[PDB]
Design a protein around this ligand. Structure first.
Ligand SMILES: N[C@H]1CN[C@@](CCCC[B-](O)(O)O)(C(=O)O)C1
Ligand SMILES: N[C@H]1CN[C@@](CCCC[B-](O)(O)O)(C(=O)O)C1
Ligand SMILES: [Mn+2]
Ligand SMILES: [Mn+2]
Ligand SMILES: [Mn+2]
Ligand SMILES: [Mn+2]
Ligand SMILES: [Mn+2]
Ligand SMILES: [Mn+2]
Lengths: 318, 323, 318
């Protein structure tokens, strides 16, 4: 039995590809609430938030895209996550692009001073506004949150409300395979631990999950924030996403990550982002992606491959 | 070719069961496997072949369902008493029986007939545990219940069904090992855990790897002494991308390589005595290549169980021709 | 900084399936040169070689199809490879069928007699003209190069120029899954080390690469010749090829092989063969295969999944 809050965040201004705002609708349509109900989760649906748009919000310093809208949407999102967490729920946020982790992690840290993050993605999303080549804020969220990067991050319009709330030793990446040269420098230079697809190929997902927990919760229990980008999966399994990168996690590795997070019993918040149903070549590819998003969330709250969720007490005798 | 690493005596049975479940099209299974080229493949491995052909099954006219759930119980139990005899015939003769399905209900017969060597051991490769009792089941389909009738520890929890009186509990808890489990119903999970039935689910394969799983499986079953092996193999243990034409497909299954590995290790013990290849449904395919892939896959599993390998070497080459 | 020469060898006479002659153009259209340039490579593209046609070329011993054509084109290819290798370039040859390895390995061995070969393929390509059942020369290249097999190889027309240049201890196979009975005999009888798909299932690709380098470069550094047949990959990843065989390398395993080759710093020549855009059922299937071929070549010259190939040592500050 878990108390689970669900928040829909139909937001796309962190990137340029249309349709990721329909990700919460597609995940809900795939039967998320019914699947969580069937696991025995006490649910509170906060619905799908309507973000206050910014009319005059264009290209900043000939590089940063929609900073005012991204900053504002995340400020609003942080308040809802804060409420859900302070009300004692494990907070599930449906994206929407990955810039939404600024809001979810900021809102979660308002109640958990010792929170740790497991970031599952093909990308590190740790470019600063000065290292980004694209200027898309979904490839930059971790830079605003990390304490060690405060002196490397300029003040963006709409971002003055953010306070760095996580240290370099409190975030572990899993699934990396498309990292920009400044991002690689940031990971190495600041000793941020990561398990790229190459590390998974060598160690295997079991050792990857063991080492992740040893680094984060080896010394003490801590609330875990699971920030799961659907593009961490191979594009054959998750085609409906904006930045697919070949050679991703298998369905089995993805479920394994989600199961191990459940087994800690320390899961406090989950982000499931970057499901863009409009980018799938067919309705079945949109549905496949959406169903995979439901399986990650369900496994993070007790769904297992061995079918031991619904406890049986007695077998009928003849 | 005149030289082979090993010569096996193998029998092929076409059992087109369909009354074990409700989805039609699984009867065209032994036909699709043969059309792929099974017989030609076993010949190329130097097998002494004995084809028993596609068996004829007649439905019982008055077949009322037991406890208003177990659909077609008389037709399934009657057909398995006879299928057991044909399988017991081949074993006594000194042959290795291979049954083409059809659904997984045919396993009650094959394992009972085989036991008529009593010190045998089973390897159940499936996405499903097929261990529901007639009272714990919810679908009414008998293909999800074969292991309940065969276990000695489950006799007190299984009632006497119409045409199931002939079945005697032959295999004990420590004589069955599952591989590939990913869709286990709550009563099935209670049975496995409480009766200490050793298994290797997809999660276990994810952690240990297919090599360790095979090493551990044999340490359990044939570690005490050399024993005959019954390989019951459901095509749905493989991922639906590889076996798309099947009844109950569950996402996140065995890769082609993992399934060939299981079959190769089974061959390498030299103790394989019986084999089942079920749930091939050519009617459940969206394209011709999807129907052909599942048939070609099923032939690969049986061929690997009798010598076919990735490196070759099954066929023995004497000397190279000189110019 | 790697000095890389690219040679297009639009070679099809080593087999009967037409379209493989379009393999070099397909690889170049998938962005090969742009990808190598971004790695910091100093490039020289020779373009596609125009091989001298042999109009009068009848089958040898009523089996061996187009021998003179295959032999002559390889003799010409070897002169080009020999020159590029002499001029300090790591020579990338784009195929074309795998019979072109006769010319690339022959040409490379002229200036690198201590070379070793890592042969990545579903096939051993080691039938002799006397064991072949197809009569396709792309299934026989290794028999012409292997020193220990000289007494078993008859003199074919247009093949006399070939001087066996590799010993059985200097070649390692990776990916084998479709081996003919005389090929299995050669592998065992001449003690040629191999890692079939079954060896990979057991050891894992990390141990496979460690064992490969222990056998080849355990005693001294040597120039490495990587002969990569795209059909080493599973047909779902590399569909546009002549002889697809199910249960091949995953994308991750293939990148791992290439990344490990790069890490030695010894790569001296690379063949990327059997990309046949005509055999793809759709335009996307041909592009998928060509994109895969580019990833193998880029990974062999530094492309990583971690992003550390480009020098980046100082963050911009606000
Ligand atoms: N080469 C890549 C790595 N860095 C990128 C990330 C965009 C995807 C971010 B997401 O999917 O995780 O949201 C960038 O634009 O900064 C391009
Ligand atoms: N049974 C197979 C093994 N030997 C074959 C190889 C042809 C493929 C060559 B290549 O793709 O590797 O280039 C042969 O024709 O000799 C068929
Ligand atoms: Mn992301
Ligand atoms: Mn991403
Ligand atoms: Mn079954
Ligand atoms: Mn099944
Ligand atoms: Mn080849
Ligand atoms: Mn090949």
């Amino acid at each position: 039995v878990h108390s689970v809050a669900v928040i829909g965040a139909p937001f796309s201004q962190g990137q340029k590809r249309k349709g990721v705002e329909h990700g919460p609708a597609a995940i809900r349509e795939a039967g998320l609430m019914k699947r969580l109900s069937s696991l025995g989760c006490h649910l509170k649906d906060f619905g799908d938030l309507s973000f206050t748009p910014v009319p005059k919000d264009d290209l900043y310093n000939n590089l940063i895209v929609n900073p005012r809208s991204v900053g504002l949407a995340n400020q609003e999102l942080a308040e809802v996550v804060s409420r859900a967490v302070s009300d004692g729920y494990s907070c599930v946020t449906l994206g929407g692009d990955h810039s939404l982790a600024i809001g979810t992690i900021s809102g979660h840290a308002r109640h958990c001073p010792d929170l740790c993050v497991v970031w599952v993605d093909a990308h590190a999303d740790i470019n600063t506004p000065l290292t980004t080549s694209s200027g898309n804020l979904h490839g930059q969220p971790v830079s605003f949150l990390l304490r060690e990067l405060q002196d490397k991050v300029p003040q963006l319009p709409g971002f003055s409300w953010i306070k760095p709330c996580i240290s370099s030793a409190s975030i572990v990446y899993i699934g990396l395979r498309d990292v920009d040269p400044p991002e690689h420098f940031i990971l190495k230079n600041y000793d941020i631990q990561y398990f790229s697809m190459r590390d998974i190929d060598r160690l295997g997902i079991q050792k990857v999950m063991e080492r992740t927990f040893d680094l984060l919760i080896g010394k003490r229990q801590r609330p875990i924030h699971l920030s799961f980008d659907i593009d961490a999966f191979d594009p054959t399994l998750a085609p409906a996403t904006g930045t697919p990168v070949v050679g991703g996690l298998t369905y089995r590795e993805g479920m394994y990550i989600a199961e191990e997070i459940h087994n800690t019993g320390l899961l406090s918040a989950l982000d499931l982002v970057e499901v863009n149903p409009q980018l799938a070549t067919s309705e079945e590819e949109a549905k496949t992606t959406a169903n995979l998003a439901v399986d990650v969330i369900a496994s993070s709250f007790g769904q297992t491959r061995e079918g031991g969720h619904i406890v049986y007490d007695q077998l009928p005798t003849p």
